[PDB]
Every structure is written in C-alpha cells, then in structure tokens.
Amino acid sequence: TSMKIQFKTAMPPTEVLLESIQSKVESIEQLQRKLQHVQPLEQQNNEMC
C-alpha cells in the first residue's frame, strides 16, 4: 500500500521536479564543465607566465 501510495507520489514529485529541474540541472551542470576548462587554461597560462 505504501510502495503504491508513496512511490506514485514520488514519481509525481520526481517528474514534476524533473521537468523543472532537469532543465536547471543542465543549466547547472553545463556551467560546471566551464569551471573544468576555465581551470585547465588557468594553469597553462600560469605555467607559461
């Protein structure tokens, strides 16, 4: 009963969140990748400096 009731609520809460937050995840996660390139260039410039 719980598994049914709760997981149905979970799946609705998840898919409602996911719709709003998968977009914001991509927004947040594609921004993280920018740090990984902003760092890697930083070192080569410091090294070359």
Partner: protein
C-alpha cells in the same frame, strides 16, 4: 545556479590577468631581441670589412 555564475566569472578574470602579464613579459623581451640583433648586425658588418681590408693591404 546564481552562485555558480559568480564562481565562474572569477576564474576568467584571472585568465585575463595572466594573459596580460604573460604578453607583457614577451613584449619586453621583443625590444631586447631587436636591440641586440642590430648590434650583432653591426659587429658582423665590421667583421667582414676587416676580413677583406687585411687582405687588400697585404
């Protein structure tokens, strides 16, 4: 998400600060290279002058 944008821009400011000082050091070197390269050119011309001068005397 807003915090991550403040964190990102800070890195790229340092990318410029490094960029400027790196090009600035190379900029100073360039003048030195051109200063001496002329002086070496002056030396070689004078070198070649003696080389033939000493011959034409003898």
């Amino acid at each position: 998400d807003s915090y991550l944008k403040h964190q990102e821009i800070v890195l790229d400011t340092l990318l410029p600060q490094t960029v400027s000082n790196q090009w600035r050091i190379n900029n100073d070197y360039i003048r030195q290279t051109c200063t001496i390269v002329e002086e070496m050119n002056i030396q070689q011309r004078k070198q070649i002058n003696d080389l033939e001068i000493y011959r034409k005397r003898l």
